[PDB]
Amino acid sequence: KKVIIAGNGPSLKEIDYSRLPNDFDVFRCNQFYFEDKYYLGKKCKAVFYNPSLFFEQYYTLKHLIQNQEYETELIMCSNYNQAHLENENYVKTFYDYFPDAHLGYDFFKQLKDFNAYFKFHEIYFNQRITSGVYMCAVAIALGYKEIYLSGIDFYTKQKNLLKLAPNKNTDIKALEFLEKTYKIKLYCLCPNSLLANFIGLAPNLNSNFIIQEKNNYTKDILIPSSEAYGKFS
Amino acid sequence: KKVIIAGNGPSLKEIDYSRLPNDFDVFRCNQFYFEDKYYLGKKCKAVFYNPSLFFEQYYTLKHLIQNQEYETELIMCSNYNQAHLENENYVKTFYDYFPDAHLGYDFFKQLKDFNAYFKFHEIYFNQRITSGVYMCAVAIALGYKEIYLSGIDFYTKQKNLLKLAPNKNTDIKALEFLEKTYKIKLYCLCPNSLLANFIGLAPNLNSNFIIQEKNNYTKDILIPSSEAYGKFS
Amino acid sequence: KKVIIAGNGPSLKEIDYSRLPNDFDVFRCNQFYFEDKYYLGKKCKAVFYNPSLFFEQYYTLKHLIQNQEYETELIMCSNYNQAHLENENYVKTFYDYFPDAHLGYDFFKQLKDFNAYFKFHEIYFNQRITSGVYMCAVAIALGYKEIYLSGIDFYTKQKNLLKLAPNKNTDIKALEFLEKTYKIKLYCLCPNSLLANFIGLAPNLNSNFIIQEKNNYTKDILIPSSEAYGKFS
Amino acid sequence: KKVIIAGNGPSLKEIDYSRLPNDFDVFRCNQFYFEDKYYLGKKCKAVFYNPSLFFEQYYTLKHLIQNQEYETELIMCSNYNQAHLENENYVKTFYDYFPDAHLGYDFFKQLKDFNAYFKFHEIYFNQRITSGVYMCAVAIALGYKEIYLSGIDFYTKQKNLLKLAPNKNTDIKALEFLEKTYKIKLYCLCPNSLLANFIGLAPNLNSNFIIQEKNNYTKDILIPSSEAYGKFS
Ligand SMILES: CC(=O)N[C@@H]1[C@@H](O)[C@@H](F)[C@@](OP(=O)(O)OC[C@H]2O[C@@H](n3ccc(N)nc3=O)[C@H](O)[C@@H]2O)(C(=O)O)O[C@H]1[C@H](O)[C@H](O)CO
Numbered sequence: 035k036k037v038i039i040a041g042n043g044p045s046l047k048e049i050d051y052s053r054l055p056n057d058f059d060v061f062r063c064n065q066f067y068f069e070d071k072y073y074l075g076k077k078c079k080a081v082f083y084n085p086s087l088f089f090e091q092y093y094t095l096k097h098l099i100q101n102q103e104y105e106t107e108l109i110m111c112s113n114y115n116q117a118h119l120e121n122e123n124y125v126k127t128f129y130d131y132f133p134d135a136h137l138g139y140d141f142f143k144q145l146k147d148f149n150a151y152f153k154f155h156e157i158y159f160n161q162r163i164t165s166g167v168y169m170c171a172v173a174i175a176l177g178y179k180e181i182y183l184s185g186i187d188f189y190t191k192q193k194n195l196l197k198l199a200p201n202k203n204t205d206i207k208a209l210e211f212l213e214k215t216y217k218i219k220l221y222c223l224c225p226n227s228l229l230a231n232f233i234g235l236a237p238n239l240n241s242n243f244i245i246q247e248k249n250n251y252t253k254d255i256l257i258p259s260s261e262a263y264g265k266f267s
Numbered sequence: 268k269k270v271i272i273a274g275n276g277p278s279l280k281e282i283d284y285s286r287l288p289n290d291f292d293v294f295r296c297n298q299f300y301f302e303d304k305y306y307l308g309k310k311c312k313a314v315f316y317n318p319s320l321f322f323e324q325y326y327t328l329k330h331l332i333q334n335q336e337y338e339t340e341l342i343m344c345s346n347y348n349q350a351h352l353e354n355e356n357y358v359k360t361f362y363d364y365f366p367d368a369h370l371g372y373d374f375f376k377q378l379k380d381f382n383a384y385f386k387f388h389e390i391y392f393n394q395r396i397t398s399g400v401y402m403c404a405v406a407i408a409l410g411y412k413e414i415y416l417s418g419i420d421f422y423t424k425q426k427n428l429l430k431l432a433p434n435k436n437t438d439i440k441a442l443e444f445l446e447k448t449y450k451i452k453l454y455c456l457c458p459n460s461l462l463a464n465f466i467g468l469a470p471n472l473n474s475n476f477i478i479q480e481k482n483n484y485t486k487d488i489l490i491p492s493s494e495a496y497g498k499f500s
Numbered sequence: 501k502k503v504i505i506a507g508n509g510p511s512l513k514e515i516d517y518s519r520l521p522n523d524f525d526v527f528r529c530n531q532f533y534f535e536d537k538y539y540l541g542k543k544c545k546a547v548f549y550n551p552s553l554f555f556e557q558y559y560t561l562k563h564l565i566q567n568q569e570y571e572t573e574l575i576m577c578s579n580y581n582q583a584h585l586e587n588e589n590y591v592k593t594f595y596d597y598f599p600d601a602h603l604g605y606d607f608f609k610q611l612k613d614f615n616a617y618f619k620f621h622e623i624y625f626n627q628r629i630t631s632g633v634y635m636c637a638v639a640i641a642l643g644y645k646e647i648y649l650s651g652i653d654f655y656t657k658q659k660n661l662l663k664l665a666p667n668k669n670t671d672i673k674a675l676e677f678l679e680k681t682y683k684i685k686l687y688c689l690c691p692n693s694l695l696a697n698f699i700g701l702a703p704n705l706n707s708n709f710i711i712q713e714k715n716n717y718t719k720d721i722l723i724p725s726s727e728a729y730g731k732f733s
Numbered sequence: 734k735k736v737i738i739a740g741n742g743p744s745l746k747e748i749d750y751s752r753l754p755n756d757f758d759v760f761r762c763n764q765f766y767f768e769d770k771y772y773l774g775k776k777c778k779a780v781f782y783n784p785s786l787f788f789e790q791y792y793t794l795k796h797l798i799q800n801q802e803y804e805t806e807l808i809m810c811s812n813y814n815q816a817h818l819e820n821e822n823y824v825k826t827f828y829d830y831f832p833d834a835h836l837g838y839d840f841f842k843q844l845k846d847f848n849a850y851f852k853f854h855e856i857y858f859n860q861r862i863t864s865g866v867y868m869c870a871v872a873i874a875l876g877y878k879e880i881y882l883s884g885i886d887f888y889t890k891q892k893n894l895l896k897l898a899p900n901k902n903t904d905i906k907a908l909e910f911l912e913k914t915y916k917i918k919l920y921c922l923c924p925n926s927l928l929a930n931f932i933g934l935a936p937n938l939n940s941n942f943i944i945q946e947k948n949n950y951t952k953d954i955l956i957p958s959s960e961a962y963g964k965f966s
Pocket residue numbers: 040041042043044063064065084087163164165166167185186187188189199201
């Protein structure tokens with residue numbers, strides 16, 4: 035099938051929906067549930083979370099799912115099997131703590147050339163990709179052929195999130211490598227994004243999509259009990 | 268086949284045997300051999316022991332077997348692959364210390380949805396299931412379709428046991444999840460149990476069963492030599 | 501095929517060779533090369549060494565092989581996968597230090613019932629079997645059906661050996677368990693041994709065997725250089 | 734196919750190219766890119782690097798590849814799975830740091846007899862082989878039948894290299910073992926080498942080969958940033 039992969043850059047709001055493929059799977063990441071409307075609908079094929087907040091994102095997702103704000107078929111931890119990037123003890127026992135989730139690296143490492151590319155530039159040059167690229171890589175490994183990009187921009191101030199994380203060339207070069215090496219097609223869904231300097235626009239299909247508005251929704255990350263943190267540590 | 272799973276609640280004594288399936292396998296747990304009579308016969312399909320007393324239960328079982336008080340085809344350690352719940356070094360080398368036994372988690376983890384369910388509520392909410400649920404989960408993973416419950420109540424003071432261990436909604440919710448998710452049937456064999464507020468009675472078959480009385484039997488856990496403990500540590 | 505398994509008890513010298521099967525494989529152990537004559541010939545199917553002297557026995561064997569005193573097809577380390585019995589780091593990397601050798605436990609653990617039997621009595625009762633039983637167990641796992649025993653007695657004072665190691669019911673019970681459980685046949689080749697109180701004599705076949713005498717032979721264990729010991733530590 | 738394996742001894746310059754097989758794969762090692770001319774062409778089937786400089790050779794190779802000085806299909810780390818010879822933590826996570834490279838030991842250990850041979854003499858006698866032998870062993874494991882040797886001599890002073898590494902019978906005996914045991918053929922391409930006392934000359938085929946000269950080339954090992962070293966440590 036087709037996949038729309040979203041970062042959560044301002045252009046997430048600036049999709050041209052006449053270009054929306056209309057049968058598609060959706061990939062979301064990180065604080066996607068901060069969106070003020072369902073810019074891509076409620077149903078995700080995969081959501082992707084950074085290893086350093088995976089424990090709190092998983093807890094929050096289960097609340098979104100049960101509160102019926104979103105559904106997802108897959109839950110990914112966006113890992114790389116590198117000690118300087120993530121806690122290895124957590125990776126080793128992951129499937130036992132989170133039996134319905136997946137380490138993204140099980141799919142990422144299937145792209146041997148891109149994994150080699152990524153590693154070489156990160157270890158030796160400190161060049162890092164964003165979730166939106168990691169997601170294209172996992173999407174390619176999953177067998178997707180047409181990938182439609184949105185919310186990727188170059189380049190939220192919620193209380194809980196601020197308390198846990200008090201915090202382009204690389205991306206475009208990576209995305210080009212992927213496209214060139216694996217022979218899939220990349221499209222750009224956001225004409226007013228800088229991504230559109232670099233990526234061929236999704237074609238107009240005069241498609242429609244209803245953007246449902248969100249009211250009384252979850253717009254910050256949840257924080258587990260101390261006793262939960264004690265178990266996980 | 269059919270399985271009767273027993274906890275050792277007071278209702279173990281209060282089975283309505285007219286409802287007993289009459290070809291069945293039996294699952295027992297923990298201090299089941301404290302029973303003052305053979306309420307389910309001598310022959311077990313599986314006995315299940317908590318990891319923290321597994322070393323002393325295994326020793327005791329071998330004595331029951333050789334003293335011909337009980338037989339069992341399988342011996343399970345009821346583990347979960349969680350550091351805060353059990354000693355991981357012991358899990359890793361288990362099959363070498365106990366080559367005729369099984370880690371229950373090899374079967375429990377086959378129920379991906381229930382394992383996810385269990386983990387999420389235990390890690391984040393401190394909700395724990397009892398052996399009787401763990402046993403239904405292992406029974407489902409083993410391919411059983413009709414499961415008859417007894418000795419589960421909501422919710423023994425022997426010397427050796429006291430020296431080693433100086434010591435419902437969750438259960439009913441778990442059992443419902445299992446039944447709903449795996450499409451097996453749960454029956455209740457003890458009409459006078461609270462379990463019967465929640466679980467459909469096993470149907471009357473006017474079956475008979477002989478309850479053999481126990482005399483001069485093993486009714487406390489055995490304690491290994493110090494030298495045995497030294498090896499195991 | 502048939503196997504003769506030898507301990508190195510006095511009865512090794514007291515074989516009745518009229519009873520020798522005449523097509524057979526030979527299992528030897530430990531300081532077998534101390535024999536003053538080739539009581540079973542030069543050609544071994546397997547030699548078995550205790551883990552605690554495996555490094556010095558392997559070194560010595562390679563010298564026997566190259567000095568053409570003995571040949572062997574297999575080299576076994578007689579291990580059990582138990583921390584209190586052997587060094588586990590050495591077991592883990594064994595095949596990399598000794599790529600032409602085998603951990604005996606890879607075959608021993610194939611006899612699930614005997615492994616369970618062994619473990620239970622050793623861990624809990626401190627009952628240990630001798631190499632001659634370990635060898636029957638490995639021989640059974642290897643597919644042998646007729647096993648002829650010698651040099652097992654119930655129940656050498658060389659310089660190097662003394663410097664490295666300054667040092668029955670269980671056996672007979674184990675051997676009986678093996679015979680009963682795996683349905684192989686045990687024979688006794690040494691009529692004047694106590695083993696013959698317990699084991700059915702190999703039948704007379706009026707077979708002949710030449711006992712070659714040994715002259716100028718290796719009759720103590722060799723000791724590796726310090727630098728070798730430094731690597732191995 | 735045929736393989737030319739090169740060490741980088743003086744005889745690398747002294748190939749008799751009339752004897753060059755003319756369809757062949759090339760194996761290079763270590764500081765091969767110091768060559769002042771393309772004595773074997775630019776295209777390598779495999780390059781092999783010692784584990785202790787693998788991090789800096791890999792970085793340097795990627796620069797050679799991108800600077801179009803050389804191409805290679807395979808990148809090998811010449812390891813042995815021995816703690817005293819290499820860092821084991823690095824071996825364990827190798828494929829994640831270097832996803833397009835290979836541990837040479839995955840192929841070397843396929844030659845069970847040679848691996849046994851190597852280990853026995855190194856651990857116990859401190860006899861070590863050179864890269865050129867390690868390379869023949871990997872070449873045999875890879876399915877090569879005819880192996881043409883060069884740059885092996887019995888038995889560079891660049892700044893970066895000097896800063897990282899401030900630094901025959903065994904070889905000939907090993908090469909003979911390989912030839913004898915695996916039934917491949919060894920040839921010698923350098924008539925004026927001592928190797929030719931021991932190895933049958935590649936036959937004259939009056940073949941031609943163009944030796945391209947090298948100008949403005951990479952002739953020392955590159956040194957990664959500190960921050961790269963920090964990640965890798
Ligand atoms: C603090 C920190 O370092 N934050 C990083 C950020 O540099 C980047 F690594 C990324 O960005 P993330 O927030 O998930 O948002 C996902 C995508 O949304 C787009 N976007 C978002 C906001 C904005 N103002 N301009 C944009 O363009 C980006 O193009 C990106 O690819 C990522 O993983 O790619 O993740 C965050 C956090 O580590 C993460 O949110 C923790 O849950």
